[PDB]
């Protein structure tokens, strides 16, 4: 009498596991085969948009599913289409869910009018519509030396900012010569020699350059600093 | 018995010694790797030193920014219409 | 035992992996010596080309060719620190 109960108690519980396991299998077999049309962008996004990740993930020409999608192929495709992203981390979560973590570059200057450069020296490109609102310095130089010109911009800029100047542009040549551009288009034609001590000479010379420019009603066009304790100043009529 | 174990044990011991020392071993790889690192570091500075000079040589044979600077910095000659200032301590 | 026998395999493979990578660095170390010699020789010929083009008699020759004049003391404004 009691063993029949223990048999039925075990057989029924056995039946309830398989039946519940059968509908759970049906729940997990009709759900794990979906193209994961969802997308979760967790991160501080300033340049990339929600439609950018969607259009780039479908640019492969194939709607991948869950068990038929490599995240290493998605993160690379995002890298090959979005140059302003530093670290892509696309990961799958559940039947119809995705997780993509994005990290952008913070531009502190503009590199050759078409690219930008951050504080760590890294170079990248941003479309001009998403960054025209930014007032950033424009750094010029030969390719591969964005970090070197950045070191010059800071050093020449920190000294120039002491006496309330604004370094708008800083250009460097392949032979390592500098030509700065200040506010109101004041071209400082520096040279290859001691650049910091030439620039420091213009700072001390400027109070006399401006008091003479107002005497004749002229505008400072450019101040050539390629001398030793000397500087030649060009003029231009003011509008 | 233990002789069967002692045989393969001494082989691994001598095989470890031949890995650290000898030819192309660990210490040879370590020493050569340090030399190759220092050489390409020096060659990078030399190539930059040669490229920076070659860039000026490009601007020397009737160029632009390598002949006017020598005229200004070494000969003190200016362009017409430029007021020349001199700073004295 | 046969457990240490596989360590011999793991070590023998490590020897081949270490020897193969080391002989590659030796071939590159020799190539960097040839590169430095080429750079120095290239550096020597460059500094010689600089003097033939940076000669003051030649610099002054072409400086006045593009309308430049020597510094004149009367028209030279002096400023004290």
Residue numbers in the entry:
A (entry chain Q): 22 to 260
B (entry chain B): 1 to 89
C (entry chain L): 39 to 119
Mind quoting what the paper says about this structure?
This complex regulates the transglycosylation and transpeptidation activities of the FtsW-FtsI complex and PBP1b via coordination with FtsN, the trigger for the onset of constriction. A core complex at the heart of this machinery is composed of three type-II bitopic membrane proteins, the Filamentous temperature-sensitive proteins B, L and Q (FtsB, FtsL, FtsQ). For a long time, the FtsBLQ complex was believed to act as a non-enzymatic scaffold for the assembly of the divisome, but recent studies revealed it to be a positive regulator of the FtsWI complex and a negative regulator of the bi-functional PG synthase PBP1b.
Finally, it is important to note that two CCD residues, FtsBE56 and FtsBD59, are buried in the FtsB-FtsQ interface, especially for the interaction hot-spot FtsBE56 which has an accessible surface area (ASA) of only 3.8 Å², about 2% in ASA ratio. We found that the mutations of FtsBE56A or FtsBD59H did not affect the complex formation on SEC or the overall structure (RMSD ~ 0.45 Å from the wild type), and a mechanistic explanation is lacking for their apparent function in promoting cell constriction. While the overall structures remained almost the same probably due to the stabilization of crystal packing, the coiled coil might be more prone to move and this tendency could be transferred to their C-terminal linkers. Herein, unless the FtsBLQ complex adopts a different conformation in vivo which exposes FtsBE56 and FtsBD59 for direct interactions with PBP1b or FtsWI, the only other possibility for these residues to affect cell division should lie in the FtsB-FtsQ interface, which connects the coiled coil to FtsQ. Although no conclusion could yet be made, the CCD residues, FtsBE56 and FtsBD59, are likely to function as a negative regulatory element to allosterically prevent any undesired movement in the balanced interplay between FtsBLQ and the PG synthases.
